[PDB]
Amino acid sequence: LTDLPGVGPSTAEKLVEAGYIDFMKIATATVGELTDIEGISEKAAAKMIMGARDLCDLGFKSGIDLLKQRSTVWKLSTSSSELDSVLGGGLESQSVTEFAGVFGSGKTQIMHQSCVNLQNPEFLFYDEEAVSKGEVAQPKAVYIDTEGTFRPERIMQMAEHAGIDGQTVLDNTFVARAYNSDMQMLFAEKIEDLIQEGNNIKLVVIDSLTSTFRNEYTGRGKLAERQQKLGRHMATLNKLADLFNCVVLVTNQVSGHAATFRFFVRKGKGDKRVAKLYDSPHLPDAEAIFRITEKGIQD
Ligand SMILES: Nc1ncnc2c1ncn2[C@@H]1O[C@H](COP(=O)(O)OP(=O)(O)NP(=O)(O)O)[C@@H](O)[C@H]1O
Ligand SMILES: [Mg+2]
Ligand SMILES: [Mg+2]
């Protein structure tokens, strides 16, 4: 931090104590965020922000440099061929993907499968020229469970069928049981703390993203307070995904909010499930057929 213009030993201590340990967080911070650190002037805050931006090279880019930025995105396999294809490779890091669907369509199953797949290095697709092995080493997941449906037995089972160690998944997955939107949102904001503690959080799951908000803001009169709260939640999720190059997955039961990739899942015959991609930034709408068995997601 002292490398930053105007930042000395004392200021650096104030910053690290306020959660600002890396340059990107400072480079992308508002003057308000820093000035509120107390002892950090608005003039110094402005100087270090401008300084961090330059150190991080946050300016105009064009040509081949545009491709380089896009290549920092790695993708996680869903264990389904059709689904990975519809996704253009797999679940994207630096974006939020929503799996919406009717009761029992498999939203939670997909969340569990992703936690398991994170521990199979062959399921993380990336360009080794833009993404180093070190960046995706010892990956960990965070599962914010707002429904109470996290099931360690299912993790063990899916892991077994995938040929990987179930306990290893459990050891590298953090679960937080949230009973309301306040806890849900706070846990999400605390993920940055886990990373500062040395945990390479590469997958974040929110199951469910919308349940608490709906139960708390039923009265369709104060829909403003609700949309404001959820919007701030989503903004935190998107920034977290971008800054820490990780995959953010969220579920939503449906029989409006921001999400970069949107799926609607319904049941097929028995084992069968059909997931319709109806919104993404660069892909055409398409449907993927897969199944959910004791092995987890397959086909
Ligand atoms: N161990 C398992 N073996 C085979 N199928 C399983 C297993 N566990 C779960 N399933 C399937 O997963 C279905 C439930 O999927 P689930 O992910 O909970 O749907 P959901 O969308 O999250 N439901 P909800 O949260 O209520 O809206 C079951 O009813 C089973 O068919
Ligand atoms: Mg993003
Ligand atoms: Mg569920």
- Give Cα separations from 24 to 51, 56, 96, 242, 244 (angstroms): 11, 7, 20, 11, 10
The first and second tokens of residue 248, run together, are 């953010």
CA 67 centroid distance within chain: 22
Task: Return the structure tokens found at 218.
Answer: 């039923």
3-state secondary structure at position 27: helix
The residue whose CA is least distant from atom 11 of ligand 1 is 292
Could you tell me where the beta strands, DSSP code E, fall in the chain? 75-76, 91-92, 96-101, 124-125, 139-145, 173-177, 200-207, 247-253, 261-267, 272-279, 286-293, 296-298
Q: Are 206 and 144 in contact (CB under 8 A)?
A: yes
Assigned fold of 63-299: Rossmann fold (3.40.50)
With a 6 Å cutoff on the Cβ, whether 6 touches ligand 1 is no
CB 168: neighbour CB atoms within 10 A? 12
All residues at 6 or more sequence positions from 129 whose CB lies less than 8 Å from its CB, including other chains = 71
* Exposure of 167 in the CB half-sphere (CA atoms within 13 A): 0
- Structure-determination technique: X-ray
Ligand 1 atom having least distance to the Cα of 208? 25
**Residue located via tokens 């997958």:** 203
Q: Which two tokens stand for residue 155?
A: 């993790």
Hey, what are 68's tokens?
């380089």
Tokens standing for residue 138: 């010892």
Which residue's CA is the nearest one to ligand 1's atom 20?
104
Where is the chain discontinuous (C–N over 2.5 Å), named by the preceding residue?
A: 255
**Three-state DSSP state, 202:** strand
Residue 221 per-residue DSSP state = T
- Going from the Cα of 204 to the center of ligand 3, the distance in angstroms, rounded, reads 16
Q: 126 near 75, Cβ under 8 Å?
A: yes
- Cβ of 296 closer than 6 Å to ligand 1, yes or no, is no
The structure tokens 């990987």 sit at: 164
Question: Would you state the structure tokens that stand for residue 115, as one six-digit string?
Answer: 């936690």
114 lines ligand 1 (CB under 6 A): no
Q: Can you name the residues that pair with 125 across neighbouring β-strands?
A: 75
**What number of helices (H) and strands (E) belong to the chain?**
13, 12
Give the resolution to one decimal, in Å. Answer: 2.0
Cβ–ligand 1 contact at 107 (below 6 Å): yes
The one-letter code for the residue type at 36 is D
- 1-62 is classed in which CATH architecture? Orthogonal Bundle (1.10)
257 is written with which tokens? 């909010």
Residue with the smallest CA separation from ligand 1 atom 29 is: 104
CA distances (Å), origin 257, targets 98, 191, 235, 285: 10, 21, 10, 19
Q: Which ligand 1 atom sits nearest the alpha carbon of residue 103?
A: 27
In CATH terms, are 1-62 and 63-299 the same topology?
no
Buried residues in 32-59 as b, exposed as e (16+ CB within 10 A): ebbbebeebeeebbeebbebbbeeeeee
As a whole number of angstroms, the distance between CA 69 and CA 179 comes to 38
Picking from 60, 63, 58, the residue whose alpha carbon sits closest to that of residue 27 is 58
- Cα–Cα distance for residue pair 94/44, rounded to 1 Å: 30
Distance of alpha carbon 232 from alpha carbon 131, whole angstroms? 29
Nearest to 53 by CA among 18, 11, 5: 5
If DSSP codes are grouped into helix, strand and coil, which group holds residue 286?
strand
Residues 95 and 246: their CA atoms lie apart, in Å, by 8
Domain map (residue ranges) of the chain: 1-62, 63-299
The single-letter DSSP state of residue 261 is E
Query: Tokens 């009717």 label which residue?
Result: 102
Name residues whose C-beta falls within 8 Å of residue 246's C-beta, 6 or more positions apart in sequence.
93, 94, 201, 202, 203, 204, 240
